[PDB]
Amino acid sequence: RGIVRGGETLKEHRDRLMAATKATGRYAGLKTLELREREPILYNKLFSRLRAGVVDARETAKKIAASPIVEQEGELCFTLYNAAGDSLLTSTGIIIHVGTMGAAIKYMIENNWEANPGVHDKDIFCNNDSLIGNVHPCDIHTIVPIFWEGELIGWVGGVTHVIDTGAVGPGSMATGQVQRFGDGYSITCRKVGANDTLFRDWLHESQRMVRTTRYWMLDERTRIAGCHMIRKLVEEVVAEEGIEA
Amino acid sequence: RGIVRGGETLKEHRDRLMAATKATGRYAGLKTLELREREPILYNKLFSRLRAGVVDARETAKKIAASPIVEQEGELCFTLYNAAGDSLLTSTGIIIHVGTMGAAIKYMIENNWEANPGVHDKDIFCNNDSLIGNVHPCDIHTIVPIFWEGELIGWVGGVTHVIDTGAVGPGSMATGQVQRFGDGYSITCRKVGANDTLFRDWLHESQRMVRTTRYWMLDERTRIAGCHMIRKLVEEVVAEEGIEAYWKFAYEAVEHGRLGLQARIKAMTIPGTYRQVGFVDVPYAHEDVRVPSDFAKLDTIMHAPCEMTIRRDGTWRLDFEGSSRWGWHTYNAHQVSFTSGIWVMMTQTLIPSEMINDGAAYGTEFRLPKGTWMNPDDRRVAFSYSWHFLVSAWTALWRGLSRSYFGRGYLEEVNAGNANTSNWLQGGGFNQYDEIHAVNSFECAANGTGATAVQDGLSHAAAIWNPEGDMGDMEIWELAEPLVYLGRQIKASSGGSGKYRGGCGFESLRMVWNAKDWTMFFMGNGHISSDWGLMGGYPAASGYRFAAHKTNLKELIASGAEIPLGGDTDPENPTWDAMLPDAQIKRDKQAITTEEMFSDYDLYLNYMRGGPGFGDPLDREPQAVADDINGGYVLERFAGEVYGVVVRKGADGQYGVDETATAAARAQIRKDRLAKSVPVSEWMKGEREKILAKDAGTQVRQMFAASFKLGPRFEKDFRTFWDLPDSWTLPEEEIGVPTYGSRYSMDISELPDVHTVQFVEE
Amino acid sequence: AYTRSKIVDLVDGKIDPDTLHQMLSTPKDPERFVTYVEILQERMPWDDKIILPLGPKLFIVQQKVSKKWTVRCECGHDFCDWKDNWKLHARVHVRDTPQKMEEIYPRLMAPTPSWQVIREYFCPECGTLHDVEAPTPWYPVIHDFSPDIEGFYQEWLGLPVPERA
Amino acid sequence: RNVQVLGIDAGGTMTDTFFVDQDGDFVVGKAQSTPQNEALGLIASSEDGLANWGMSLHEALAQLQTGVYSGTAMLNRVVQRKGLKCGLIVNRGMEDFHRMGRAVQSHLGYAYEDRIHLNTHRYDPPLVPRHLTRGVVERTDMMGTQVIPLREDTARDAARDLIAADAEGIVISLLHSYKNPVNERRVRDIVLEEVEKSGKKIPVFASADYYPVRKETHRTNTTILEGYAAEPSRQTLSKISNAFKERGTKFDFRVMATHGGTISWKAKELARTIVSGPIGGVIGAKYLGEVLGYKNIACSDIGGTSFDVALITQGEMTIKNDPDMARLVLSLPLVAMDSVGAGAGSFIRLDPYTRAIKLGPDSAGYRVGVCWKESGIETVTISDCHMVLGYLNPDNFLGGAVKLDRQRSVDAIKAQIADPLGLSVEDAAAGVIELLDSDLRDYLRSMISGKGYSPASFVCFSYGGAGPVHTYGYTEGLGFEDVIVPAWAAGFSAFGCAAADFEYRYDKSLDINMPTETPDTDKEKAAATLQAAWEELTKNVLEEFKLNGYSADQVTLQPGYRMQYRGQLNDLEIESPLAQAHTAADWDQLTDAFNATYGRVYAASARSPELGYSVTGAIMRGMVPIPKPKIPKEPEEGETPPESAKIGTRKFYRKKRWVDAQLYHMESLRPGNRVMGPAVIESDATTFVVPDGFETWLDGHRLFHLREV
Ligand SMILES: Nc1ncnc2c1ncn2[C@@H]1O[C@H](COP(=O)(O)O)[C@@H](O)[C@H]1O
Ligand SMILES: [Mg+2]
Ligand SMILES: [Mg+2]
Ligand SMILES: [Mg+2]
Ligand SMILES: [Mg+2]
Ligand SMILES: [Mg+2]
Ligand SMILES: [Mg+2]
Ligand SMILES: [Mn+2]
Ligand SMILES: [Mn+2]
Ligand SMILES: [Zn+2]
């Protein structure tokens, strides 16, 4: 049985949606929008609550950080995705990562992360790999799947620009290296936690591959906070308005 | 409930064993060995089956690999550990990793891996982190726990040297980077699999962080095969002989090892104090060292003095007070790799017929002051070519031990020391299969060995890190490098002169062929020979570079013109250079470089070093000098000047000895030596004047200044020896070179939740 | 035990490969030291008693009349008291120029003398070369070995210490 | 009696034959070897063996279905370093590669302890000295592309240099000639032209014509042995084949090869049979071990010239590609064994300067020693020490057919060894035997320790004519589980040749490369390529069985292939689950069978299917049934030998004491019997020595068990 709600695998689900997009010229083959057209009050209520949720995650979680880049300048973003990795709503801030974090989710879909290492409720993924679409290594993604009654119904992504990733040059926009080798600590959709808990091998390794260790650590707690705030809000919205809507 | 058999946690178990070791002086407090003493037949059967198992894992699993470094040369090792991370038995091969993999297990123990991420049956761990003790990033460890009836009873470790780990420089022993940042993909005791299955996120990530992906993948399958072969064998042995007997052996075998070292020291050596030193060069000022950080651009020298004490009770102690500081290069080390290499040396001389495991480490005391290059105190240091310093410090310890052997009459055991293990031919770009690639030749697995008190050293034979030397087949290296051989020759006049001559090295001439977008570089000792001769013998020859660009060889080959082939027989009187009138030739002492563009038909000389000599060359058997000239071991012109032997070419083309003229030449050289020398007091007076005037190059002054700050006992010794006034001082800042890291440093143990394991006095 | 003949062949560098391998690969003969020193004693042109060999032609000896212990060359020359460094009383030749290095190595294979020098230490009577150091400029003369002779004789060999003034 | 199988062990001091009838009953023959023409001693050995059944050579030879030759003539040239004087032509600039020994030759054949103990490492002199080596200017790359065209004038000058240096054979080995042999074969043709102008008889050996496989060190050593060790035996097999056909045989001789299977006597590449004799011994040991339940066996054999050792572990011989033997890297696939120059004919000499005793490595061979007055041997041998000490009977050497004189051994040992050392004659001879026992003991121990074992994990089998003469000495204190001397020790290698399956095997290389998933057409094409090789190799196998009078319906065929993951340097031999291959599904079945075997050889987690597959070769074997030798199974009688088994006493010297050793006739002893040392148990072609401090007992399988007391 596939993990997406209804029993499709992640890849089966996305492939069906992309084929209908191509055949009809409308996203997912949606010729009409039933909820929007027939239930406009409920459509607007979901919009209002979920957009406020993502905005609030950015505004609140940034107070965790030690780095002024995140805490004062607001160079962070939180985004809500459907099961196929397409974004529904986002905070403002560094919103280029609406696309980069969705493309990372789609890489997991297309390369059968579902069968190994598995995508489980309360897992934590981390990613920054520019070979699968990211801007640069200093923009670190934390990605958490969202489940309802044992099936996957979406994902949430959070990004922070960190001060450094241990490239040859000391800075975010570094010079010195001329290739990937020396361009910084590069993480490819790694499972870095389970049961809402970060793995110690990840913690020890990551922290010694950068210069600005303490700043790195608090940027990570910033991303996990906002991801979990949004997961909780989605669970509440579904409980109150029903999964079908 | 803790996971170790009996219910202790990993940390509780190890702490109990270390406390008993400290209180009693015996490993684990074992005052008697019950299994060994009361059940000798069963003890020997476990020894035989398990030692054969680890030997078989190495011999069999290496046939998986695509890289000739693993498959032909055998640069891999498999080791069986008890629950506390102490080794019981090992295969041969790169056995420095007996210590590095045990220290990685002890890091997991000490940092509560048991609680997170957990240590479960059928887990797979991977590790290469030099901050917790490894040699360098290219030595990759796979570590698997061993369980019996749901509790942990041991571990198995397997290591392979891989071609590259995606450092700035393309090779294993890379230059270009000056810090951890760019020193290669570094993995800290990562859980990379469970239920005997590797995780896909690990597979995708690891494979794109290296150049030599396919070679990397098969080296990984090599390590997992051997680990699982050994796990299965341990399960069978326990099933057949019972867990109680195995559980006794797993600690008794270590104490048996310690007892073996103590007995060998008392049988072979002499109690006393032995003093010796080694050095090597770091010529980073040269324009062909293109490093990206200006604070790294300077010439320095490694300093490694050692005070060795052998006690009446058969214990011994090695103290490296006075050593130089870590630096901005790839030659730094760690207390674990430094002391594990001394253990490797011990296996080749003191304990080859005893138990080969961690017991001998428990029988040795080490002092490595914190902040020296062998025990650094800064988490930014680079390690890719750790060996440059390591092999240059260990060679002096052979000389100390050999004085004990010589004094006692065990002349068969004397050895003047190990060669510097270099050059390392390296480079990268596109290969003959049109794929991204890197090369790292293991021809310098086969260097000269030190002379003995009874016979000459062996030429092109071994390395300190693996005594089973192998140069590989030319036809096999040609499958793994876009290069072709134009020569392979014994290296004349490389072995250190003496009554007994050190082993010669060898050399190969390469032409670039079927490469695209290609670079190469050199790495080895240049200005300084690290080894010294013993009791009158001389050091081996030092290093140099030969490379040629824009050679025009395509047209020279086609036109029937003379072409360079063989070795660079006499680099003072070369023949190749005149054959290449249009080439850009680099022929100089710069034995360290960063990557430079090469094209098809360009040339590169790979030169492997010789080993040190023994005794006064004036006592060498004259026929052995003539044999050496005829055999290509020694150039003719040194027979007279070095050995006092007069040779002449006979009708058959062979050199023969003039015995009368040789006796006269040797009598005359004795008089020459008296006439040209001075009393040591007189020479000391003149050298002291230069010290007072600060008359030496910046590289010499920086070495003393840095050594003085880390080693006040050494500064006191130097001042006393040279009778220097208190008004004379040598601060590093007055030299005029960069001194970043001389005062400010931050150790890995300063980061949150990091607990380091202590193995030495510091 | 090995025969006296085989230990003679070992000292001369003429030992056969089977005996040499046996010596290397089996537990040591405790009798080696006493036989070794007796063989060396018989070759010396003086009758003062060897206490410990330091090199092929260099020894700690007991003076026949005074019973002091000195470092001595095979030719008979006494350098100093056994606790002092014999090198401080020797003659030295220092190779600290490229010409001097090129007498004993080819150019390019030679060490560079502003980084490493070669220091040759001779007996002042016969010109025997007893040691070659290869350190940096400015490096102290090395005191190679201070043996615990009392401990060696009494505790490891089970022999009394020879008479000493 | 209907006699069906003949096995042979030639080239030693004594030639042994082993005959098996339709019921599995056997007899063993012996005669003196005749190295000028081995057939003469072989016929005499055959008549001696068949006389035990009251049968003539004429009667039996007509009935034989197969015969397998083995011997030591070629091996003896290797271990003594007494071969044809070969020169070597390689690439200019790489003349040194042979003598460098790839470094690895300084530590081959060593114990675990000696591998790490650096000062024990040592190079033996090269097969071809540097002054008999020259180089031609040429380079061909790994693809077969010419980088540097052959300069033919340099090939001519190389040839003339080696002819003027009096080379008796010339070997040619150029880099990657196995891939593109054009340049190496042109150098061969030019060398042949210069030899023709010289008028001298100098055979030429190009590596590509004999051993066309990668690794120049391995290939060049092997091609050298073809000239150095094999060439002087080139005509032996055709002389044997003719002598036997004249006397009525109808089968085609087979010969035991390095890999433990047999090949045709017509093989061009003779070094494939360089250890035929010792390999026959291992096959024998494996068969005996299977019948009686011995899984871990340390094989050990002394003859006139060599001591051979091999390990069987968990019932398997371990066949190694690119092996080593006699401290030489080689290209012949080899069951794990080794051999050294130490035997009962080894010469004893004093070093002129040190007076050290030196044993071998050369031997008197069939000439025995000074004790055989008609030999013309002047230098004492180990056999002369056996005479002095009472190890062997002067009056029962080859059953009394060769008369030995102990007084000649006494006089010669006195003049050559004892008087110069200041020793009595018996102390000089005893000292020689102490050195031998210790050398052999260390060699056996080292083979076991090189695999990581202790001797306690093994049972030792001791065989060959001279094996039982020194078993007491070379196993002393090693702690073997048991130590076993078969009563048929002298014919043990001939026994193994007779117990070999009647099998012919042919191989062919291939180059099929396949991604993990490919369309069906690619799989069909791969299958067809393999099928075509199987059809060709099937003709070669069946043609050989036809020459032995077996038609195709009597032969059982077993196809095989060599497979690996792409990019690997090594492959695995897989037995095909299909008799033929055609479909895409067939190809998938062959790749599945490889993955499963790889999991068993290594581990399940080592499999790497994501890299794809390469098939590197095809194999076909064919078999027909023959009777195996029946191992005796008699019931035990008492502990006391019958009085009629005693045949006198002889003065016997060991550890500074003369004793009266009790002599027994081996074949008169009964199952159950125990014999306490000092004793000598004598047959007509072997002698089992049991000194004071040892004891033996005989089982129902005609195996003696040796113990320390
Ligand atoms: N009665 C015997 N006749 C001949 N050889 C014997 C006898 N007993 C033992 N041998 C040994 O068998 C050896 C010949 O072995 P091989 O070279 O295998 O034929 C001789 O060198 C003898 O030492
Ligand atoms: Mg003067
Ligand atoms: Mg700490
Ligand atoms: Mg025989
Ligand atoms: Mg034999
Ligand atoms: Mg031997
Ligand atoms: Mg082997
Ligand atoms: Mn950014
Ligand atoms: Mn390595
Ligand atoms: Zn003197």
Author numbering:
A (entry chain A): 15 to 259
B (entry chain D): 15 to 776
C (entry chain F): 2 to 166
D (entry chain E): 9 to 717
Tell me what the authors wrote about this structure, in their words.
ACs contain metal ions but not organic cofactors, and use ATP to activate substrates through phosphorylation. The first structural rationale for acetone carboxylation is presented here, focusing on the 360 kDa (αβγ)2 heterohexameric AC from Xanthobacter autotrophicus in the ligand-free, AMP-bound, and acetate coordinated states. Like many carboxylases, AC is a heteromultimeric enzyme complex.
To examine the proposed ligand exchange mechanism at the Mn catalytic site, the acetate/AMP-bound structure of AC was characterized. Acetate was used as a product analog because of the instability of the native product acetoacetate in aqueous solution. In this structure, acetate is bound at the Mn site and α-Glu89 resumes its position oriented away from the Mn. The collapse of this channel is apparent in the acetate/AMP-bound structure, which shows a reorganized Mn-proximal α-helix in addition to movement of α-Glu89. (d) Our acetate/AMP bound structure describes two intermediates or possibly the acetoacetate product electrostatically displacing Glu89, which results in the formation of the Mn-proximal α-helix. This switch triggers the closing of the interior channel and the reopening of the substrate channel for nucleotide departure and new access.
